[PDB]
RNA sequence: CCAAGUCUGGGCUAAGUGGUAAAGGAUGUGGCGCCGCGAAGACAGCCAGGAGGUUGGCUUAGAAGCAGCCAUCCUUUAAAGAGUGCGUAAUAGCUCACUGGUCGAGUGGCGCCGCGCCGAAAAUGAUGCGGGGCUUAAGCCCAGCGCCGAAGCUGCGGGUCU
RNA sequence: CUCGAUGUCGGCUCGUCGCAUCCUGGGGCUGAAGAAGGUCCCAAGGGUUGGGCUGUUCGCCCAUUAAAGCGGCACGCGAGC
RNA sequence: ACCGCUGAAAGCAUCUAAGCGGGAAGCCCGCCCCAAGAUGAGGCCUCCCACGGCGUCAAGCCGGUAAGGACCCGGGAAGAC
């Protein structure tokens, strides 16, 4: 039970649902084992099942849509934070360049759709077109270098703490 | 024919710096007989009569550049193989035999108090008795000599022609001098 | 070379005479002490109690053995004898003073202290 | 880790189910439970 | 069912040795309990024991009335070997029989003592139910 | 390659079961069934433990051998050759059937595959 | 595989349970009763003050809910908190056990069940009997329907003793 | 079942399974910083040493080591000692 | 095992049924060693050409083709034969 703003070119087709806007050109997949939900100006949930069971099946769906959407229009963000008395990083290549010790830093790469941010060395972040897809890699470096809490250093989550 | 190969030179070692022994190895270039394919169909092995004078007396790299050698006529002159490279051989064991399982495979012998007893070489045992008859496990008399033996990090040092021929990483060619020799650097580690 | 109970005279005086060999140190498996090589082995008699005593555990090394030691100069050596010196925990002498020269090993795994009082190193 | 015999420890550490499994959670380490 | 030889020639007479009945406190109509439907020369000790246990956790107002008590008892190795078997006896019970008023957590408002011998089935042995009397529990 | 016409059929979806069953059944009396489309095929749901039991023909290893095919193709070997017996007929009442891939001739390709497809 | 309904009816399984096991667990799932409310506009979102005499007794060197043994009451007022809770040296912050605007139509609780998942580790190699089977797949429960199948019982005919 | 007979302890050799795993990797836990230990879940590949005294296994002792495993199969093996 | 992402049913959370990834001396592959007698006898190249007379679906009896092979001899780290 949503909507799809300005420029949702909406595409449900054999179950897969082409979604295009601005800066988020996706063609996501969804379900023919359930019903399609869609209008012109709007769009939704189908009851192909009604019941508890599919009824969240759906129930998850519609965030799925919702995805499509504002990942259609205003692509997703991922916050990290940079907190390491030695660790640091500051973009570098087509990939970012992080270093926290060891002796060989590394560089990552955000293939095609992610996209990484060195806002200041310290800090950084990516903005991708799925929230899915971004979380996920988001964090896949976010620990990739221990954050071990062991009393405050390395990638961790924004919005953490400490320990003892 | 995918590969390259001779037949075993003999051992020696000799120089170097620190010294170090190796083995030579014969073989120019063998001719090129067709080359693996299984295109449009079944492909493999053609034979456009151009070989010897006798052999009808009996009458993608790799195989790639053979197409190079192959085509050119038939021979191909062997030693990409160059200055200090690891391609691999498979010698062919050595009429040997049917021996004891004393050396065909370890195995302690007949101890002291009984190691004489005009007694010796045999095995110690087969199976339980509730298990079950056999297994095809333990080996056994299992004749040697003719084995199509091999082996790995095969170190090629150098080589020259007089005779197009090669100089060797330590032998053990496996067969004997005279033999049949085929290398390679497969997998290799060293790399 | 040199384990079970083979025997082997001092060239340093520690105090010592002769040695049993126990074990070959290294670990596991390992059958074998060679020049160089460190033993686990004591003492079948030693001097009037210089400072060893006979029958006292020990811990000496490989300078000397009839074995032969093929010279990574595809050269050869060998000695009259079979024997070595003791050592503290920390690769080291006791024996003040060295006797039958030795090669040039022992450098090659740490001990020089032998490796010069020595009176010749071949 | 009791693998058998598991039941809430902070006022809060969850039951979740994986795999049907059942495998306590909560805000602590001091909670891993499983079985 | 096999029981003993009798009731003064083998093995009759005694005080079974236990923790007699009554604890808790009184209440004339919350009915707050506990019985089973386990069949078992309940485990004398075991039995003895775990009520007790029962008290160990509470301590005063909530029926700790207990309706059982073992009488009779086993045997078994003493002499020879295994054949001709005398009797050498120890561990004496009762038989639950399938189920039955067990002990009783009763009172007012005091499940304080509810949760208790709760903590009292728990232990126990041979399952146990958990139930109310007359009313339920308050 | 191409052959008769005399046992035209295919798969895909349905159930692999009684599927087999008759192919035989006509493997018995006396036909030949040559088909195809493995992958397509169908089976019990549970996949996962749905591509076990057959992984089970899978490693099914012993000594003595225990080879276990790995391509749709068996699968249905399998099966299908389990209706017959090993005498006679129903031996090459197994040569007489015989299946393949995509298409030669005018969940069933997940657990082979899986365990080897 | 081997003869006989991939019968029909209506439930229940989403683990291959079926194809061995107990005590002991858990908003699994499906069907039954209870306490409180949604226009004193309800549980889990969000704004805010997160009340005072409560800082009582053993031990105090520290109970002063948040060491533990006993209390469990009073209040001026929006009600309460015998202050269940993370702590520190006791004190010192948050958290509901409280409700306005913005939502708005079903939300939390125990008894009764029928199905089911962790506990449940073994020695040659693997197992429903085998191939196998997930709303006739098939299992399991309750309903009607017709076919199989003994040398048993009818038909055929002979045998034989009382 | 076997007395018209299955030759029994330990050793030797040749081993083969198994996992409740001793060494070994992977993990979560800790009253874990490091390092090293403890706790428990997943994995058997490979591997898990010389002597001593004892008929012994077991076991104590000596020098190692990453380690120096528990147990199957008539507590495997006499038509093999 | 073990760790995560995206998110239902529980309008708040959840590695989760469905969607996607992380992670082991371990499985599969890869590295060597066979090996279609795997009766599903596999591929391919390079040779040989239609001989005789007899009743038959004579797919049966003879010269053959050194294509070709053999046997006997002489020899081999090939080897009991």
Redesign the pocket.
């Known amino acids: 039970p949503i909507e799809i703003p300005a420029g949702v070119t909406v595409t449900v087709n054999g179950n897969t649902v082409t979604v295009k806007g601005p800066k988020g050109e996706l063609t996501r997949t969804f379900h023919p084992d359930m019903t399609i939900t869609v209008e012109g100006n709007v769009i939704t949930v189908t009851r192909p099942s009604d ?10 769906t ?3 849509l919702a ?1 499509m959407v504002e990942g259609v229009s205003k692509g997703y963000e ?1 916050a990290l934070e940079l907190v390491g008395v030695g660790y640091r990083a500051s973009k570098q290549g087509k990939k970012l360049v992080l270093s926290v010790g060891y002796s060989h830093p590394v560089e990552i790469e955000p293939e095609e759709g992610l996209e990484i941010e060195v806002p200041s060395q310290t800090k950084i972040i990516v903005k991708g077109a ?3 897809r ?3 890699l ?3 470096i976010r ?1 990739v270098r221990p954050p071990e809490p ?1 009393k405050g250093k390395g990638i961790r ?1 924004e919005g953490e703490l400490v320990r003892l | 024919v995918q590969g390259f190969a001779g037949y075993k030179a003999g051992m020696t070692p000799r120089e170097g710096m620190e010294t170090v022994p190796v083995t030579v190895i014969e073989t120019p270039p063998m001719r090129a007989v ?1 080359l693996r394919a299984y295109e449009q ?9 151009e070989f010897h004078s006798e052999l ?1 007396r ?2 993608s790299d790799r195989l790639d550049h053979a197409l190079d050698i192959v085509e050119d006529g038939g021979e191909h002159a062997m030693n990409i193989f160059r200055a200090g490279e690891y391609a ?1 051989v ?1 010698g ?7 021996q004891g399982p004393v050396k065909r ?5 007949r ?1 002291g108090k ?1 190691a004489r ?1 005009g ?1 010796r070489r045999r ?10 008859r056999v ?1 095809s ?2 080996p056994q008399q299992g ?8 082996e ?1 990090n095969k170190r090629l040092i150098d080589i020259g022609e007089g005779g197009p021929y090669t100089l060797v990483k330590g032998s053990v060619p496996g ?4 033999l049949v020799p085929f290398f ?1 650097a ?2 290799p580690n060293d790399q | 070379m040199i ?2 109970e083979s025997r082997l005279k001092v060239a340093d005086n520690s105090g010592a005479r002769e040695v049993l060999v ?9 059958r074998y002490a060679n020049i160089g090589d460190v033993v ?1 082995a004591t003492v079948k008699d030693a001097t009037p109690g210089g400072v060893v005593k006979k029958g006292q ?1 020990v ?1 000496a090394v490989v300078v000397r053995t009839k074995r032969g030691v093929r010279r990574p100069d595809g050269s050869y050596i060998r000695f009259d004898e079979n024997a070595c010196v003791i050592i503290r925990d920390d690769k080291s002498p006791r024996g003040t003073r060295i006797f039958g020269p030795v090669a040039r090993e022992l450098r090659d795994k740490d001990f020089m202290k032998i490796i010069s009082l020595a009176p010749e190193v071949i | ?1 009791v ?6 420890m902070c ?1 809060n550490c ?10 306590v ?1 909560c805000s ?3 909670h ?1 439970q ?2 | 069912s096999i029981k003993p030889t009798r009731r003064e020639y083998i093995s009759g007479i005694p005080g079974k040795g236990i923790a007699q009945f009554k604890m808790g406190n009184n209440t004339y109509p919350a009915q707050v309990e506990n019985v089973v439907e386990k069949p078992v020369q309940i485990r004398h000790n075991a039995l003895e024991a775990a009520r007790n246990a029962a008290n160990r956790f509470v ?1 005063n107002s909530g029926k700790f009335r207990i309706r059982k008590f073992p009488f009779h008892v086993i045997r078994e190795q003493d002499g020879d070997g295994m054949r001709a078997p005398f009797g050498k006896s120890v561990g004496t019970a009762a038989r639950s029989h399938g189920a039955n008023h067990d002990f009783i957590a009763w009172v007012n408002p005091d499940p304080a003592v509810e949760f208790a011998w709760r903590r009292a ?2 232990k126990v042995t041979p ?2 139910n958990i139930d109310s009397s007359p009313a339920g529990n308050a | 390659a191409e052959f008769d016409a005399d046992v035209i059929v295919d798969a895909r979806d349905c ?7 008759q192919v ?2 006509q493997a ?1 009396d006396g036909e030949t069934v040559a088909v195809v489309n493995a992958e397509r095929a ?5 996949e ?3 591509v076990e ?2 992984e ?2 899978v ?6 051998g ?1 080879f276990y095919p790995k391509r749709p ?1 068996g ?1 249905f ?9 090993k005498k006679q007929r129903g031996r090459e009442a197994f ?1 007489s059937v ?1 299946v393949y891939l995509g298409n030669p001739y005018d969940t069933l390709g997940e657990i082979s595959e899986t365990l080897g497809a």
């Open positions: 019941e508890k069971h599919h009824r969240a099946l759906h129930g998850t519609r965030s799925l995805n991922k799925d929230k899915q971004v979380g996920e988001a964090a896949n620990a062991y989550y | 067709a169909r079944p492909l493999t092995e053609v034979w456009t009569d009808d009996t009458l691999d498979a062919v064991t050595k009429g040997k035999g049917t495979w370890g195995v302690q012998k101890k009984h007893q007694w095995i110690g045992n087969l199976g339980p008795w509730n298990p079950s297994r496990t333990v004749q040697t000599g003719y084995h199509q033996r091999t790995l067969p004997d001098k005279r390679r497969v997998r | 384990q079970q126990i074990k070959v140190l290294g670990g596991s498996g390992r686990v555990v811990k | 880790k693998r058998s015999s598991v039941k809430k006022d969850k039951v979740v189910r994986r795999h049907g499994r059942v495998l959670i602590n380490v001091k891993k499983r079985q | 301590q089935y728990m399952t146990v | 159930i692999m079961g009684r599927v087999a069953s035989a059944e018995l169908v089976i019990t749901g549970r996962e433990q749905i039991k057959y089970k023909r490693d099914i290893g012993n000594d003595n225990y193709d699968i070997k399998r099966t299908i050759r389990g209706m017959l017996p040569e015989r």
